[PDB]
Amino acid sequence: XXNXXYX
Amino acid sequence: XXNXXYX
Amino acid sequence: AXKXX
Amino acid sequence: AXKXX
Numbered sequence A, B: 001x002x003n004x005x006y007x
Numbered sequence C, D: 001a002x003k004x005x
């Protein structure tokens, strides 16, 4: 990952 | 808020 | 709820 | 490391 969300 | 990121 | 990474 | 919310 390395990003986030939330999807 | 209520969403995420990371911006 | 709370997808992500 | 986590701008968000």
Ligand SMILES: *[C@@H]1O[C@H](CO)[C@@H](O)[C@H](O)[C@H]1O[C@H]1C[C@](C)(N)[C@@H](O)[C@H](C)O1
Pocket (backbone or CB within 6 Å): C002, D002, D004, D005
């Ligand atoms: C989400 O980010 C905000 C801003 O930095 C933090 O205050 C919060 O701790 C963080 O939420 C964490 C903990 C949680 C709400 N239980 C999880 O659902 C979330 C994905 O991560």
Ligand SMILES: *[C@@H]1O[C@H](CO)[C@@H](O)[C@H](O)[C@H]1O[C@H]1C[C@](C)(N)[C@@H](O)[C@H](C)O1
Pocket (backbone or CB within 6 Å): C002, C004, C005, D001, D002
């Ligand atoms: C998501 O990132 C925020 C900012 O660093 C943390 O506060 C939060 O603990 C983190 O959420 C945790 C728990 C999770 C949502 N189930 C995991 O998918 C995530 C990687 O770590």
Ligand SMILES: *[C@H]1C[C@](C)(N)[C@@H](O)[C@H](C)O1
Pocket (backbone or CB within 6 Å): A002, A003, A004, B005, B006, B007, D001, D002, D003
């Ligand atoms: C969350 C993770 C990220 C997208 N790599 C970073 O740039 C942001 C500020 O925090």
Ligand SMILES: *[C@H]1C[C@](C)(N)[C@@H](O)[C@H](C)O1
Pocket (backbone or CB within 6 Å): A005, A006, A007, B002, B003, B004, C001, C002, C003
């Ligand atoms: C993160 C927060 C959110 C956008 N409200 C939720 O729908 C997602 C699945 O988790």
